[model samples]
Target: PNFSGNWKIIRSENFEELLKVLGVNVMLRKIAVAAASKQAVEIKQEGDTFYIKVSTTVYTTEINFKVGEEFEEQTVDGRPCKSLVKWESENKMVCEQKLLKGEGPKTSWTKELTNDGELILTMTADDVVCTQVFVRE
Candidate 1:
């Protein structure tokens, strides 16, 4: 399925654990989790190029990339990174990000569309994993 729609988070699991593994400060972790709980994601694709936006009450993050190309990106906590995204399958997309100029755990995420038309995001950092489910708006 094409990931070209606006989706709002409906369910989330282990997000706090993921944040903890990333070394987010306690106070920031709390705020991050709270904002993510009510976030929305928008994706627009044209051929191999993609424009993605993640929005919360506090901030909005925008990323544009072409498949198989590495580009600069910033993490949720504002860490600078280089990111590459590719299609894992027709219905699944995977992205990997590594710190651009410093040492940090590499983070990755997989996005897949369910048969029920829901968007599923599975994010990984080290051994921690977070999953978020989104429904169409």
Candidate 2:
């Protein structure tokens, strides 16, 4: 299965925990931890190429990659990374976000489409797990 669609953030649980781990600075923590206002995610796919856009009222980041291909990337908070995206299961995608520039925490993310037609985003960092729920637009 492919995850290619426009999705809007609907619910976020324990997101503050991950935000806290990512709280490299006070201002950065506040902006990154803001409630899911105006947060939307779009995923597009073309053969081996995939485009992911995560946008919010205060942050926006776009990434392009081929599944299982590794490349250098920078997180929204400016943390550099050697990232890799792969399909772990039929409908689940996993991302290994290995920090390349700084040392802080492990920020790995996974996405899966649920039977209820919702998408689930699980972000893990510093042993903190945050789950964000999404619905198709």
Candidate 3:
């Protein structure tokens, strides 16, 4: 299953928690809330490789990865990091990210495609889990 298309964040639960854990300030969070809702994401796929670009008023982030391949990634705000992602099952993908700062904590992210055709992103770090839902456009 390839997740290559434009998507929009529709519902977010615990998203702020994840941002907080990442040390994002309150002011930034407020800005992020607005940005996240209005942000647009585009994903492209070539076989097992995938390229994703997320655009918002504040900033834009891009990523390129292949199933089972490890690559360097950056945090939402462009902080350097390393990540490995793989397809766990049909309509499901998982990623493990190692930050480049502050003891370099590892975070896990899970992507699930719901029956309603929405994409749900779940991020977990140090036992804290946050979920954000998206819809294809």
- Best of the candidates, TM-score: 1
User: Is candidate 1 or 2 superior in lDDT?
Assistant: 1
User: Which parts of model 3 have CA positions greater than 4 angstroms off?
Assistant: 101-104
Residue-by-residue lDDT tens digits, candidate 2, 1-137 = 55799999888877666666776666666556674656799999786588889888776788889988997777534688898988887778898898876587778888898888999998888688889899999
Identify the runs in model 1 with alpha carbons over 4 angstroms from their true place: none
lDDT of 1 at 9: 98
Candidate 1 overall Cα lDDT vs. reference? 0.87
**Residues 39-132 of candidate 3: C-alpha lDDT, one tens digit per residue:** 6778887887889897887777888888898899876444777888888888788998877676644577787877788888887766668787
Predicted structure 3: lDDT = 0.78
Q: What is the lDDT of every predicted structure here?
A: 0.87, 0.80, 0.78
Candidate 3 residue-pair clash tally? 0
- Output the better candidate (1/3) by TM-score: 1
Q: Lowest lDDT 10-mer window, candidate 1?
A: 74-83
Q: What is the Å distance of residue 81 in model 2 from its true position?
A: 0.4
TM-score of each: 0.92, 0.86, 0.86
Cα deviation at 25, candidate 3, in Å, is 2.5
